[PDB]
Design a protein around this ligand. Structure first.
Ligand code: NVA
Ligand code: NVA
Ligand code: NVA
Ligand code: CL
Ligand code: CL
Ligand code: CL
Ligand code: CL
Ligand code: CL
Lengths: 307, 307, 307
């Protein structure tokens, strides 16, 4: 049974209810376990990219192909948007040709406009502000270990960026406890924190934004990090210095549960945000986490294309 | 049935008779209305692009996929032609691997050479001189409104460029009246004008090349424009002032029929060649026009591949 | 019978026995002659390219499509390797999504690492050091003419580059006599020469590395050359001066058999490494040679995917 969703698009996870998120995760687990069937026969997903990608690009197109459809890679440097065509005109023409769009870009507003002006589904494959498909797969990865979100503690330590934003919203939706530790000056966006906190009031989630990483990871079941300079960001040399106390290393993780697992969206820079010892060690699940991008997105695609 | 064509390639529309063009339009209209069948099962169309594209790139690959075949995007920057491999050599090797080629580039002579040296069909997806697949779709769009080309008047106002050339030839082939207005120094190519006039002698088409835009649009059924600086032309900034009197705006279109429709190949630059008021207003059909790139091209592909 | 191979990967041809190479060539000839069947139904081959390509890029994707599978083009400029992601991390995530990888790049070591860290097959589609699929297709092309490798003489005249290396190892594997002439300072890698000589001891191949092109081509059945400046090279301007005596032209080829045939991997630069008179003349088989990239690689793909 394909999950029914009351949304055309997936831009932040705010669009989904708790029950819809759980249904997507269960359907992804089903698709992971069972023989491939051509549920999206003949369907074409456009894949617009304005930023680098390995996992998102390959997993989306492979997912479509496994479902009997097609992915069409559209480098943003080749589209007439480069030459000043509006996002609205783009949306309207693509709706005549293909069945959905996944877009990865800088401006979140541009993805909102694309969705608004498109008659086909639009999926955010990462913006400066949100990476929802990553957080959906991460929820699946956590659920495969725990079989529940109740009483689970996730600690994110790092920069208050797009990935942090999506994990905050994801955790709040499913009722999972989440702490964030960032350096001063690099907190997650306050409006997104407020939205997560509001959601958490209804679900029982405890969301805390902190500066002390040792306190944040205390008794955590999962520790998550990400790179210190994201694709959207301008360099500060002083940033690297401020982030040193936020590295995920042996000294930090000993404050979490002995049974904790390490998560990272990838790509990773060993000896910056995380040491080789941690990411390549026995508590790391980053490759299975990455694998689940495929399954979680196939569930999302089948549900959105069924509308 | 599938239209029979007496050409391997489609470079300018000169290669087609009136009857063949009408047959293509009727077949496109059939394909637009009827269930997709895999008429090109297993066929691979190579898509060589040396210039930006949204509509041509997406519509050709979607068309192929919808007919059970494949489109293979080939950025010109990645091909060995960028490192000096000849067009002839490229033609000969691609003919061993794939079933047809669509090419968008600068030099029309290059596309002529590709067709001459290739044993597979070659389609011009725009050159500096011709954009024949656009004009074929534009004929289809007109025909859907009028159900005839007899007594219809098309007015093109703008630069004497590739799209103007293809519309001149298309109009002449089907017997439609066409007027052109361009600024002094920007007339369509005189050899192409002569070809169109020669074709028009046989078909009853009245082709008129003018400078005054108000005279050109008088009692028109359709007003068509395009950008002032084509991809073949970035240096030429002077144009922007010269072309201001050629803008499609409320003051201009009142001289056409009250029932006129506005066409534009896209991409468009609002407040340059056309105002938002016109392109976004109730007489604009530019998005249906763009949608018909898909269907007109599918008809062409099935016919060329039938040979 | 699909050939059984005792290797997961194809990086240099060293991985293959003489019997395996012959079996591959026979299978390629069969595939060339016989109707397409979907032997690789559903399979996805990633095609990672850091360098320009026409033949390799098109032939590998067409081959997959013709076998009922898919080729996914991945420009190296768009992958997170560009932003510092390790080859190992890349290998581990791709293995979750797709079924094999073909990679064209600079560093042969990177391709070795990709193969080591990947659970799926890896194929070298050219590196600075080896171009094994080219030499496999070249052996097929020779065998189609001669029906044997015994008593056949191949002469390569040019730069001691990646293609020279692969021809050396190919010739030694099948027992064909091969001579090389290069300028002073541009010999093939001495360790590769040693490996070829060792293989040749077992097979009866005579391999000679020389400076005098007229001596090298004496009584040759085949003459082969390639460009003087490969994609990986930023060689001195003095190089062109040293290469003047090494052009393949009428004066040189008269020293070979009257029945010789000319080979070139392509792309070629007429009037540099070879004259138009030779490459377009009656002894040239370069376009059949390029065509055989398709068939030889389809044989390899099927065999690797089976294993
Ligand atoms: C997947 C990349 C995530 C990272 N925060 C970035 O935006 O660069
Ligand atoms: C579809 C683009 C048409 C325009 N005349 C150009 O050549 O840029
Ligand atoms: C197929 C190209 C071969 C040439 N030696 C190069 O590496 O550029
Ligand atoms: Cl960012
Ligand atoms: Cl893992
Ligand atoms: Cl419209
Ligand atoms: Cl090189
Ligand atoms: Cl040939």
């Amino acid at each position: 049974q394909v999950p029914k969703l009351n949304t055309k698009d997936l831009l932040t996870l705010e669009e989904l209810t708790q029950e819809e998120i759980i249904s997507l995760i269960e359907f992804a687990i089903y698709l992971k376990k069972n023989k491939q069937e051509p549920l999206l026969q003949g369907k074409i997903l456009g894949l617009i990219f304005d930023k680098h990608s390995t996992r998102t690009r390959v997993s989306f197109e492979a997912g479509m192909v496994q479902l009997g459809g097609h992915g069409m890679f559209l480098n943003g440097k080749e589209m007439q948007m480069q030459r000043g065509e509006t996002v609205s005109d783009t949306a309207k023409v693509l709706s005549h040709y293909i069945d959905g769009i996944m877009i990865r870009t800088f401006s979140h507003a541009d993805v909102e406009e694309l969705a608004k002006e498109s008659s086909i589904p639009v999926i955010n494959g990462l913006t400066d502000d949100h990476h929802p498909c990553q957080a959906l797969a991460d929820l699946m990865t956590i659920y495969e270990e725990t079989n529940t979100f109740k009483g689970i503690k996730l600690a994110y330590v790092g920069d208050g960026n797009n990935v942090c934003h999506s994990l905050l919203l994801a955790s709040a939706k499913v009722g999972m406890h989440m702490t964030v530790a960032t350096p001063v000056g690099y907190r997650p966006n306050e409006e997104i924190v407020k939205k997560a906190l509001a959601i958490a009031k209804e679900t029982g989630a405890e969301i805390e934004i902190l500066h002390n990483p040792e306190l944040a990871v205390n008794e955590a079941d999962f520790i998550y990090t990400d790179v210190w300079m994201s694709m959207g960001q301008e360099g500060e040399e002083e940033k690297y210095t401020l982030f040193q106390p936020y590295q995920i290393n042996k000294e930090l993780v000993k404050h979490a549960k002995q049974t904790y697992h390490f998560l990272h969206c990838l790509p990773a820079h060993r000896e910056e945000e995380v040491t080789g010892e941690i990411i390549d060690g026995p508590q790391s699940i980053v490759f299975e986490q990455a694998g689940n991008r495929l399954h979680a997105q196939k569930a999302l695609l089948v549900s959105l294309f069924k509308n």
